[PDB]
Amino acid sequence: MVAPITTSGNKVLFGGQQGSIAGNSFFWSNTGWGGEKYYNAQTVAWLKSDWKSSLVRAAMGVDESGGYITDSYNKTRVTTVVDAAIANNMYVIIDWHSHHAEQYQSQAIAFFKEMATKYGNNNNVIYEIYNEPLQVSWSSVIKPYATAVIAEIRKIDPDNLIVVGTPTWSQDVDVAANDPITGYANIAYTLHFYAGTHGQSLRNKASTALSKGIPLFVTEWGSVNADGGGSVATAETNSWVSFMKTNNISNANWALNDKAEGASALVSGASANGGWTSSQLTASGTLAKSIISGWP
């Protein structure tokens, strides 16, 4: 039903043609952290019908407090959002939302094997296997774990996109480009930016990476500071959108959530049933709807 996603050189393709999609990341799924109330079919359908979103990202907390490693119901929140994205003809990222993914390798393999088995025949699904590595080695920390998890997914789901986290909160895509994962089909690399913190020096590294032949996917970006706080950087966000559209870079905005921080798209109390009007969107949410609604 939706077009299958593939990669070829530095391009992420849809039904074999260049293009890109825009949508939304939910906040951490973790029990007690307040983003869980939006993991439901009404909010998913509303992002589709009112924001024209093409994509939702289920950000399943792993080793953080209330994450999947101690609270099994995180997986239920993910499957609820996956089923709803399929029901609404939207792509969906299943995101192992950890800063230490290599330390939970067997758990990550088991989880992605169960997902690939249940969902691997749907074109909608994208596997994101390591949200945000920290200041750790690409060759000696991330790449060996990413290779192990990809080997296992590809034995079950030969095709659907896998997106791999990069060093330094998924900034160092130019490092991954110097030592890419070869031999497996349809693998892209994560770039995260926050417009209040990151500008031209980070676009320069993304340009280097694309020049060296690797495809990028922005599974998370914000218009505020990297810690999720602060003011919307409208002009810097525009420069990033220009860069993403130039290079057909798909993207998910952080976060569809109503916590009292700058990155939250919604004003606190915004209904979990969706139906939000203009005043229930924060400065960041207003700008993200504009970008997503206008995406080519």
Distance between CA atoms of residues 262 and 222, nearest Å: 9
What tokens appear for 203 in the block? 């676009």
Let me know: does 284 contact 263? Beta carbons within 8 Å.
Answer: yes
Alpha carbons 292 and 102: distance in angstroms, whole number: 33
Residue 52 is encoded by which pair of tokens?
């024209």
Specify which residues 280 forms β-bridges with: none
Q: What is the spatial distance between Cα 51 and Cα 190, in angstroms, rounded to a whole number?
A: 24
Query: Domain range holding 59?
Result: 1-296
Please tell me the total count of domains within the chain.
1
* Polymer length of the chain: 296
- C-alpha neighbours within 13 Å on the C-beta side of residue 145: 27
Radius of gyration, CA atoms only, the chain: 17
Query: Cα separation of 48 and 25, whole Å?
Result: 13
d(CA 185, CA 182): 8
Which of 36, 102, 128, 220 is catalytic? The answer is: 220
d(CA 286, CA 273): 18
As a three-state string, the secondary structure of the chain is: CCCCEEEECCEEEECCEECCCEEEEECCCCCCCCCHHHCCHHHHHHHHHHHCCCEEEEEEECCCCCCCCCCCHHHHHHHHHHHHHHHCCCEEEEEEECCCHHHHHHHHHHHHHHHHHHHCCCCCEEEECCCCCCCCCHHHHHHHHHHHHHHHHHHHCCCCCEEECCHHHHCCHHHHHCCCCCCCCCEEEEEEEECCCCCHHHHHHHHHHHHCCCCEEEEEEECCCCCCCCCCCHHHHHHHHHHHHHCCCCEEEEEECCCCCCCCCECCCCCCCCCCCHHHECHHHHHHHHHHHCCC
Instruction: Give backbone dihedrals phi and psi of 164, rounded to 5 degrees, phi first.
Output: -110, 125
**Resolution of this entry in Å?**
1.8
Cβ proximity of 216 and 247 under 8 Å: yes
CATH number for the domain that contains residue 150: 3.20.20.80
Q: Is 132 an active-site residue?
A: yes
Distance CA 85, CA 121 (A): 14
Q: How far apart are CA 38 and CA 211, in angstroms?
A: 38
**Strands ordered across the beta sheet of 5-8:** 5-8, 11-14, 17-18
From 63, 62, 5, select the one nearest 217 (Cα to Cα). 5
Q: Which of 132, 152, 236, 261 is catalytic?
A: 132
Which tokens sit at 29? 């799924």
- Give, in order, the Cα–Cα distances in Å from 134 to each of 138, 141, 258: 10, 10, 26
CA 9 to chain centre: 21
- Fill in the amino acid letter for 66: G
**Beta pairing, strands 11-14 & 5-8:** antiparallel
